[PDB]
Design a protein around this ligand. Structure first.
Ligand SMILES: *[C@@H]1O[C@H](CO)[C@@H](O[C@@H]2O[C@H](CO)[C@@H](O[C@@H]3O[C@H](CO[C@H]4O[C@H](CO)[C@@H](O)[C@H](O)[C@@H]4O)[C@@H](O)[C@H](O[C@H]4O[C@H](CO)[C@@H](O)[C@H](O)[C@@H]4O)[C@@H]3O)[C@H](O)[C@H]2NC(C)=O)[C@H](O)[C@H]1NC(C)=O
Ligand SMILES: *[C@H]1O[C@H](CO)[C@@H](O[C@@H]2O[C@H](CO)[C@@H](O[C@@H]3O[C@H](CO[C@H]4O[C@H](CO)[C@@H](O)[C@H](O)[C@@H]4O)[C@@H](O)[C@H](O[C@H]4O[C@H](CO)[C@@H](O)[C@H](O)[C@@H]4O)[C@@H]3O)[C@H](O)[C@H]2NC(C)=O)[C@H](O)[C@H]1NC(C)=O
Ligand SMILES: CCCCCCCCOCCOCCOCCOCCO
Ligand SMILES: CCCCCCCCOCCOCCOCCOCCO
Ligand SMILES: [Ca+2]
Ligand SMILES: [Ca+2]
Lengths: 448, 87, 448
C-alpha cells in the first residue's frame, strides 16, 4: 500500500516498514491531520506560555523564535502529548543554563491510538519535524546544524525519522529510552541509529525484556554514546509500594505515570536534572554493569567520562565510534546527580566486628557517611569501596571515620592509619592518623 | 595475440596499431603479445612510425616529435627509438 | 543446534546466525579441522617462503615472528586459499615500505564448500584468528593493538569475527569488498561493522546488486571510512573482451580470476598498490559519484582526503564518525594510483570547432595530455574540467595547451590567455600567454 499527503510525500506499507518479522502487520500512517503534529514554542522571552508554529516562514519570522539562537525539539511518545509537564521542565531547566528555542512537539492526536498504530504515525511525526527543519534551513537560512532533537519512547524514533529525512545533518538526536517493540531489530531505516544525526546519544532507563518483566525500553544499542544509568534495567526509586509511588511528591498525576512506566519515564527525569548539574552524571566504560558495581573500573578514563544527558555532546571521544556504552549511578529522586568516589581505609585498634564508615570534607562542602566495609574489623587490613556521594565535595581537605555495632563493656577502639580518596578525576588524596576511637565516634584524619 | 576487431581499449589484444583506439599496439619484446597501449608523453621514450605496425615503444602524443635514432638498422629491427620533445 | 569445539567454544545455529531472513537456512560451522585454518608467516627476514604458526606460544616464539614489530593478517575468502599470489603481493609490497609480521591466513579447507556453508565456517576462521590474537596478547604479551587484519569477500567478515571476539581491540580491520549475500542486512553480530575494531576502513569495488548485474560486493556501508573507487559498481579495466581478460599480462590464472570476479577482485589490487603510492589514492567526500564525475567537489577538504587502501589509517577525521563515504578514481591496470587535478583554460584566437588539451609540468615530472573541453572553441570563454593524471607532477612550473580537428586551409589559430591548475591540495597555480597556435601545436604557458 501507499498513501501520499500534501507536504509530507508518500508512505509505503512495504518492508522493512511492515511485513518484516519484528513488525509483522501491514498498516499505514494516519492523515497528517490526525496525528495533528503541533509545534509548541517556548523561549527565555516566554517560558510559562507557548507560541505555536507551523512550517510557514512568516509564522516563525513573526514569532519569539530566534535564529541567532539554537533549537531543541522535544518529542513525546505513546499515550502522551507535547504539553505534559516533563516537556516544559526540560525547557525551563534549559532556560536556566541556556538561551534557546525550545520547541515542544505535540502529536497527541497521533499518539493515543493503538501501539502498533502509534509506532506507525511516528513517520509522519518524524516527517513533520523533518519538514520544519527543511523550511528553517532553506526558506529561513537556519542550518540543521543548530537543531538538537530529543525524543522519548516512540518519540526518539520520530527524531530518527526527522534525522533520516534530513540526510543526517541535524547536530544531535537524544534518545530518552527508545521504544523497543517493533523498533528493536528493524533496519537503520526504521529505528533511531547513529546515522540519523551528526551525534546520537541514547539513555537507556528501561532495557531488558518486554517478556516477561515488562520493559518498554531498548536493550539494543543505538547512537554513538549509550548510557545505562543504574545498569539500565531497574531504576532506583521505582520499587516503592503502590501508595507511595502514586501519591508521589510531584502530585498524583506524576505518581500514576511513574506507577505505569516508572523506569521508562526516568529517562527524561535524568535528562532534566543533568541540564543543571553539568558534572553530576559522569559515565564509566565497563565490560558490564555487574563488573562496575563489583567496583572494578573507576575513575574516569584519561579522555573523560561522558556526562549522561544534556552534556554528552561535549565528550571528546564522542563520534569516535558507535555503541560506546557507559555506566553511572543516579539518585532515587528528583535531584539524581551523584558523584562517585573511591575510598580505601586501613584499620588500627584491634579485632572487632562491625561497619566502617567515612565522610568526605572538601572546599566545596561535605558528604554523608558512606559505608565502606562491614564484618570482622581488625588492624592493618586495608578495605575499600566506592560509593555515589550525593554531594560533590570538591577538592578534599579532610575525611572522618566512624564505626559501629560491636562493643562489649570492653569499649574496644578501632581507627584508620590512612584513608585515600580517589575522585573520578583520578586524583588520590591521602589522609592519615594514628588515633583510634570507640564506636559511634568521629575520628577526623588529616592529609598526611 | 589475435585481435581482429576494431577500436580496442588499452590492455585489449591487438595484431596491429590500426585496431587500438590509441593507435599504438605496443608489446615489450618480439616474443611478447601486442596489447593496445597509450601514446608516449613528452619526455618519455617513443618510436618513430614503423611499417611493422606494432611497437616496442609507442609514438608520441600529438604536438610531439620522437627525437632519437632514425637509422637503417633501426627501421628493419623496429628500434628507431627516440624521446618525445616539443618541435 | 549447537556445536562446541576444543579451542574455539560453541557455535549456535540460532538467529541472527541463521533463520533471519537474509540468511534463512539453518546450518552450522564445520569442525575446526575441515576449515583447517592455517597461519602462513612471512617476514622481511623471509619473504618468498613462509613459516607456519599455530596458536602455540612456543611455535611463535621459535619463529621469525617478531613482537617488536607489528602484525597484519590477510584472510582470503570463498573459493580461495591463503597461498594465492594476491596474499603474498600484499606482504611483498608491505615489506618494501615496512618491517612487519605478514600472516597470510589459509582456510582453503573451509572455503571450497558451498557458498552458504563457507559463509558459515568464517565464524571458525574468525574464531581461529581471534584465538591467535588472544595467545599473542596473554601468553606472549603482544597487544591486540599492533594487529591489523585485512580480509577480502567472506574474509572481511572473518576479520569481523576475530574483531568481535576480541572485544574490538584490534587496531584496524580492512574490508576489501565484503561479501554481500547473507551478510548485508544481518546485525552487527554477523557482518563487519565499525564495532569489530578500533578502525574499520572498507573498500567497495563491487557493490550494486547481485540481482541482476551479478555483484558480489556490498552496497551497505560498514566501517568508519568507506571508499567507493570508480564509484563502486564498475571497476575500469574489467569490461575487456573475453580473450583479453583471460590472457591478461599477469598470466592466465589472473585473467580467469578476473574473468570470474574482476570488479570484486580489484579491491586487493588497489590495496596492494596503495602500499607503494602513499598519495596516489586520495578520496573525496561527495553527495554521490555522479556529482563527483560532474566535477562538483574538488579539491580535498581542509582536513584532508583519506588515502584509500593502506593509508586510510592516517586520515585525521578517521574514527570521528561512521560510514563516511569517499570517491576517488583509479587506474585500469596495475599501477592504479591517480592524482586528480582541476584545470580551467581561457581561450584566445577565434571561433573554431575542436578539442582543447592541456599537459602539466612540475618539479617532479610531467603529465599526459588530458582533454579539458571539446566543442565550439571560441575566444574568452573559460572552460574547465578535472582529470585523473597518472603522473603526480608535483609543484607546477609550466603547462602547455594543444587543440585539434578543425582546420580549413584557413589555418585558424586558438590559444589560452590563462590556465589555472588546482592540485587536490587546494593550491591554484596561474599560467598565462597572449600567444595563439594552430592545431596540433604545443603552446607553453608560463606562470603569470
Ligand atoms: C536531504 O536529503 C537529500 C540529500 O541529497 C536532499 O535531496 C535528495 O533527497 C532524497 C529524497 O527527496 C535523497 O535520498 C535519501 O536516501 C535515504 C536512504 O538511504 C541511502 O542514502 C544514501 C544513498 O543511497 C547512501 O549513502 C546510504 O548508504 C543509503 O543507501 C532516505 O533518507 C530517503 O529515502 C526515503 O525518502 C522518502 C521521502 O521521505 C521515503 O518515503 C522513500 O520511499 C524512502 O524511504 C532519502 O530520500 C536523494 O538521493 C537526495 N539527492 C541527492 C542528489 O543526493 C534533500 O532535499 C535534503 N534535505 C535536507 C534537510 O537536507
Ligand atoms: C575481551 O573482554 C574482557 C577484557 O576486559 C575479557 O573478559 C570478559 O570477556 C567477556 C567475553 O570474553 C566479555 O563479554 C562479551 O559479551 C558481549 C555480549 O554482547 C554485548 O556486548 C556488551 C557486553 O554485554 C554490551 O555493551 C553490548 O551492547 C551487548 O549486550 C559479546 O561481544 C561476547 O558474547 C558473544 O560473543 C561470544 C565471544 O566469542 C560468542 O561466542 C557468545 O556466545 C556471544 O554470541 C563477549 O563474550 C566481558 O565483558 C569481559 N569483562 C572484563 C572485565 O574483562 C575477554 O575474555 C577479552 N578478550 C580480549 C582480547 O579482550
Ligand atoms: C485513549 C485514552 C488514554 C489511554 C490510557 C493510558 C494508560 C496509562 O497512561 C499513563 C500516561 O502515559 C505515560 C507513559 O507513556 C509511555 C510512552 O511514552 C510517552 C512519552 O511522552
Ligand atoms: C562462471 C564460470 C564457471 C564456474 C567458476 C567456479 C570456480 C572459480 O574459481 C576460480 C578462481 O576464482 C576467483 C574468484 O573467487 C571469489 C568469487 O567470490 C564470489 C562471492 O564473493
Ligand atoms: Ca534511522
Ligand atoms: Ca561485527
Amino acid at each position: 500500500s501507499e498513501v501520499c499527503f500534501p507536504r509530507l510525500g508518500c508512505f509505503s506499507d512495504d518492508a522493512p516498514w511492515a511485513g518484516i518479522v519484528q513488525r509483522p502487520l501491514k498498516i499505514l500512517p494516519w492523515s497528517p491531520k490526525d496525528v495533528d503534529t503541533r509545534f509548541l514554542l517556548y523561549t527565555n522571552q516566554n517560558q510559562n506560555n507557548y507560541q505555536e508554529l507551523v512550517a510557514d516562514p512568516s509564522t516563525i519570522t513573526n514569532s519569539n523564535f530566534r535564529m541567532d539562537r539554537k533549537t531543541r525539539f522535544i518529542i513525546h511518545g505513546f499515550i502522551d502529548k507535547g504539553e505534559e509537564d516533563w516537556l516544559s521542565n526540560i525547557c525551563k531547566n534549559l532556560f536556566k543554563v541556556e538561551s534557546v528555542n525550545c520547541i515542544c512537539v505535540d502529536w497527541k492526536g497521533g499518539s493515543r491510538t493503538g501501539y502498533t498504530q502509534a509506532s506507525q504515525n511516528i513517520r509522519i511525526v518524524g516527517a513533520e519535524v523533518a519538514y520544519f527543519v527543511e523550511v528553517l534551513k532553506s526558506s529561513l537560512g537556519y542550518s540543521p546544524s543548530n537543531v538538537h532533537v530529543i525524543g522519548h519512547s516512540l518519540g526518539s524514533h520520530a527524531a530518527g525519522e526527522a534525522g533520516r529525512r534530513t540526510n543526517g545533518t541535524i547536530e544531535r538526536i537524544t534518545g530518552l529510552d527508545p521504544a523497543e517493540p517493533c523498533f528493536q531489530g528493524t533496519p537503520e531505516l526504521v529505528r533511531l541509529d547513529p546515522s540519523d544525526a551528526k551525534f546520537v546519544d541514547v539513555i537507556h532507563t528501561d532495557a531488558a525484556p518486554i517478556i516477561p518483566n515488562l520493559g518498554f525500553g531498548m536493550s539494543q544499542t543505538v547512537g554513538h554514546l549509550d548510557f545505562f544509568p543504574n545498569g539500565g534495567k531497574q531504576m532506583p526509586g521505582c520499587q516503592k509500594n503502590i501508595l507511595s509511588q502514586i501519591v508521589d511528591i510531584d502530585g498524583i498525576w506524576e505518581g500514576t505515570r511513574d506507577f505505569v512506566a516508572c523506569n521508562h519515564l526516568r529517562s527524561y527525569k535524568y535528562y532534566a536534572d543533568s541540564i543543571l548539574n553539568p558534572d553530576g552524571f559522569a559515565g564509566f566504560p565497563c565490560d558490564s554493569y555487574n563488573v562496575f558495581t563489583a567496583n572494578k573500573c573507576f575513575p574516569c578514563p584519561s579522555e573523560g567520562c561522558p556526562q549522561m544527558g544534556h552534556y554528552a555532546d561535549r565528550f571528546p571521544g564522542k563520534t569516535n565510534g558507535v555503541s560506546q556504552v557507559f555506566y553511572l549511578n543516579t539518585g532515587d529522586a528528583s535531584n539524581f546527580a551523584r558523584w562517585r568516589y573511591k575510598v580505601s581505609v586501613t584499620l588500627s585498634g584491634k579485632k572487632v566486628t562491625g561497619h566502617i564508615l567515612v565522610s568526605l570534607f572538601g572546599n566545596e562542602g561535605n558528604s554523608r557517611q558512606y559505608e565502606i566495609y562491614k564484618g570482622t574489623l581488625q588492624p592493618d587490613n586495608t578495605h575499600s569501596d566506592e560509593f555515589d556521594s550525593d554531594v560533590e565535595v570538591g577538592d578534599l581537605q579532610k575525611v572522618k571515620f566512624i564505626w559501629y555495632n560491636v562493643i562489649n563493656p570492653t569499649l574496644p577502639r578501632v581507627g584508620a592509619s590512612k584513608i585515600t580518596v580517589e575522585r573520578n578525576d583520578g586524583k588520590v588524596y591521602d589522609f592519615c592518623s594514628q588515633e583510634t576511637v570507640r564506636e559511634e565516634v568521629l575520628l577526623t584524619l588529616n592529609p598526611c | 595475440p589475435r585481435g581482429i576487431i576494431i577500436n580496442l581499449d588499452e590492455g585489449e589484444l591487438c595484431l596491429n596499431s590500426a585496431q587500438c583506439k590509441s593507435n599504438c599496439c605496443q608489446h615489450d619484446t618480439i616474443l611478447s603479445l601486442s596489447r593496445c597501449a597509450l601514446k608516449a608523453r613528452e619526455n618519455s621514450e617513443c618510436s618513430a612510425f614503423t611499417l611493422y605496425g606494432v611497437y616496442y615503444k609507442c609514438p608520441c602524443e600529438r604536438g610531439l616529435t620522437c627525437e632519437g635514432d632514425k637509422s637503417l638498422v633501426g627501421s628493419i629491427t623496429n628500434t628507431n627509438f627516440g624521446i618525445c620533445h616539443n618541435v
